[PDB]
Design a protein around this nucleic acid. Structure first.
Lengths: 79, 76
DNA sequence: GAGTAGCACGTGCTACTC
DNA sequence: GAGTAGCACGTGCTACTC
């Protein structure tokens, strides 16, 4: 009866808890004794993803600039 | 008192729900999708691992090109 | 002590599926 | 119709902060 729904929910929450702890593992989160809040984790994860994307954009851009810089040096080295 | 306690917990839950919505939309596989909280945590985890790997690989490429270039400035 | 934030439960609802 | 998935609410504790 109710012990079926109540038991399924408790198991649903546990698995969700496992997903949260894992995400907590990644992400600098905080230094020393960390905090859960669930709220602080969701916040930090979003901001970290944001940082990863900004670094990606800047890396792809510098690679392109370095490549243009390289072809110029090569053509120059010809003369 | 319970009426008020109930109202504040409801507010607290709403902020967490908004935060799940915002994380979901920061992930390029779930944005604009009806994803459960389980899917949001799992895909964000995946995306973060993916992005860290990509950014490292590009960092290498950036050092490889820097070494290659600084060595051409010499020949030049 | 008064006022909460954070959390785990036990439940009720809704939308699906066959 | 009955089972399941995912939510969100009401509630009572812990552990502060003022």
């Amino acid at each position: 009866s109710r012990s079926t729904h109540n038991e399924m929910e408790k198991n649903r929450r546990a698995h969700l808890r496992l997903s949260l702890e894992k995400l907590k593992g990644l992400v600098p989160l905080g230094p020393d004794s960390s905090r859960h809040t669930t709220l602080s984790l969701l916040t930090k994860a979003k901001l970290h993803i944001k940082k990863l994307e900004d670094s990606d954009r800047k890396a792809v851009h510098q690679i392109d600039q370095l490549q243009r810089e390289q072809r110029h040096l090569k053509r120059q080295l010809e003369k | 008192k319970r009426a008020h306690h109930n109202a504040l917990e409801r507010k607290r839950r709403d902020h967490i729900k908004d935060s799940f919505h915002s994380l979901r939309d920061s992930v390029p596989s779930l944005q604009g999708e009806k994803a459960s909280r389980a899917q949001i945590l799992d895909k964000a985890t995946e995306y973060i691992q993916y992005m860290r790997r990509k950014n490292h690989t590009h960092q290498q490429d950036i050092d490889d090109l820097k070494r290659q270039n600084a060595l051409l400035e010499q020949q030049v």
